[PDB]
């Protein structure tokens, strides 16, 4: 697999650039500085780590390294905590949009910068505690050979338990949040359509501006698309592991397929800046400013 490596490199460079661009935008332009965008910045950073770290670890583990059980389990599962943090932020954002759009009168005092701080900190902690189950002593170790004495080679499939990837990951810490996220979002959308359809039958300004509503709802859809693509990303991999696990002594997945879900899920962190540029005028204009500036500088 030559192409594969030059690939995971192309990824790292992309993800790093695009997300550094998002964070530089948010720092640079005051309009982007706000709770929603602190969670968005969390997403950016967690997707930068994958660029600088998770891909090199994706590239060592292919070549079958050998080391201490736990120090091996790190490089084995790291992108785990990243992915988890990505979910936590996505959900924080869905909820923030939910307060904003469903209960706009209490959003002012309810959602604050410092509280954003706290929820983010916490979410990172928990992204770790959950992120690597191995590190806490939960053990697939102790059951190549002559690799080493005090060193047991660490490769995902065997040194990574599939009784978790398909249970404490796919079933618990991914599908559930993703799902009540789909819920919160559909609730926002249906409700907003209801009250718009209502504002129509009663000439404005009945309660709040229709234009405003439609605008923040369009923005919510742009934000929910990010979730949709996240799902479209880790879903294939979790399907693979999913049915490969429920029939452990049944069949397994190829090289030429199985080596996708890794690439793909690794692609999940590349697209965000592009989705922003496409769906959101403030980012697009800022990226445009940063690039149109610091290029010809």
């Amino acid at each position, epitope marked *: 697999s030559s192409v594969y490596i030059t690939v995971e490199l192309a990824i790292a460079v992309l993800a790093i650039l695009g997300n550094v661009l998002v964070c530089w935008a948010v720092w640079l332009n*005051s309009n982007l500085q*706000n709770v929603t965008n602190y969670f968005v910045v969390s997403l950016a950073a967690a997707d930068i780590a994958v660029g600088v770290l998770a891909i090199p670890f994706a590239i060592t583990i292919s070549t079958g390294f050998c080391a201490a059980c736990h120090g091996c389990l790190f490089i084995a599962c790291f992108v785990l905590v990243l992915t988890q943090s990505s979910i936590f932020s996505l959900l924080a954002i869905a909820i923030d949009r939910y307060i904003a759009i469903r209960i706009p009168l209490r959003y*002012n*005092g309810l959602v604050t910068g410092t509280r954003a701080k706290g929820i983010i900190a916490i979410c990172w902690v928990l992204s770790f505690a959950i992120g690597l189950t191995p590190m806490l002593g939960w053990n697939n170790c102790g059951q190549s050979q002559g690799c080493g004495e005090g060193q047991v080679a660490c490769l995902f499939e065997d040194v990574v338990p599939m009784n978790y990837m398909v249970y404490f990951n796919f079933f618990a810490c991914v599908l559930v949040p993703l799902l009540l996220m789909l819920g919160v979002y559909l609730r926002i959308f249906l409700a907003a359509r209801r009250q718009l359809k209502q504002m129509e039958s009663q000439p404005l300004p009945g309660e709040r*501006a229709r*234009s405003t509503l439609q*605008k923040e709802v369009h923005a919510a859809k742009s934000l929910a698309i990010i979730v949709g693509l996240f799902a479209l990303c880790w879903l294939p991999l979790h399907i693979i592991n999913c049915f490969t696990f429920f029939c452990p002594d049944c069949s397994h997945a190829p090289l030429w397929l199985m080596y996708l879900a890794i690439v793909l899920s690794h692609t999940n962190s590349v697209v965000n800046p592009f989705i922003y540029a496409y769906r*959101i*005028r403030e980012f697009r204009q800022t990226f445009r400013k940063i690039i149109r500036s610091h290029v010809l500088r």
Partner: antibody
Framework: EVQLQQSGAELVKPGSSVKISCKTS????????MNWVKQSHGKSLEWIGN????????RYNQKFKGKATLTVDKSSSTAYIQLNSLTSEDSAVYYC?????????????????WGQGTTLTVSS | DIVMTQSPASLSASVGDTVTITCRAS??????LTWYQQKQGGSPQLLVY???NLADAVPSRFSGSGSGTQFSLKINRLQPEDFGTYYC?????????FGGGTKLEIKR
């Protein structure tokens, strides 16, 4: 149906202070920042500052720092601006406006509702 | 602090023709710019927000546009109800400021 009803015209000697009020009816007062604008000679507008009704927290334009003082009585849904050490140059019409807020990916801001305005005349 | 500069200061025009007002910012405010309409003896009314966005019930013949440092409001087939003074305001930053206004007068 939202309405910002400002206090009536004010005529005072230079050296004195004044408190103009804006009562809000038809929505939640604590949900939006209240702003004050000064219009001079029927033309030029200037942003004086704004106040968060919930916390009473304020941001002033530098030019009016120390001249204006913003305050809120949430009980009555009423916001006040008070002007101190009045001179003729303070003679103008003062508006309270209400700030709207939403997220388009940026923070979107506007003054959607304005008061009828209040005339202040400062002369000896 | 960021400074708005609006032109022309006054413009006379006839019902039915097209008019354009310009706001120019001393810095980069991106899209955060508001247009207000004031009728004689009235209070400024919200017209455009986010530089491109028509307020509720404002007629489609109104259009906002521009970005960064440069903005324009345009009225298409002028109606008699459209004469008055227009103002720009930037919402960028912690401290805000207005254009000097454009007075739109009837040509006879």
């Amino acid at each position: 149906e939202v309405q910002l009803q400002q206090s009536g015209a004010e005529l005072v000697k230079p050296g004195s202070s004044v408190k103009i009020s804006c009562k809000t009816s038809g929505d939640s007062f604590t949900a939006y920042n209240m702003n004050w604008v000064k219009q001079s000679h029927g033309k030029s507008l200037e942003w004086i500052g704004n106040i968060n009704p919930y916390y009473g927290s304020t941001r002033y334009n530098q030019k009016f720092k120390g001249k204006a003082t913003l305050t809120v009585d949430k009980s009555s849904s009423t916001a006040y601006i008070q002007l101190n050490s009045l001179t003729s140059e303070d003679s103008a019409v003062y508006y309270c406006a209400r700030e709207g807020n939403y997220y388009d990916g940026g923070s979107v801001r506007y003054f959607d509702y304005w008061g009828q305005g209040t005339t202040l005349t400062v002369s000896s | 602090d960021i400074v708005m500069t609006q032109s022309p200061a006054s413009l006379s025009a006839s019902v039915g023709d097209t008019v354009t007002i310009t706001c120019r910012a001393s810095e980069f405010i991106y899209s955060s710019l508001t247009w207000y309409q004031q009728k004689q003896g009235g209070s400024p009314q919200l017209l455009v927000y986010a530089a491109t966005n028509l307020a509720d019930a404002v007629p489609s013949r109104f259009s906002g546009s521009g970005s960064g440092t440069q903005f324009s409001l345009k009225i298409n087939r002028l109606q008699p109800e459209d004469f008055g003074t227009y103002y720009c305001q930037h919402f960028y930053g912690s401290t805000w400021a207005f254009g000097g206004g454009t007075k739109l007068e009837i040509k006879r």
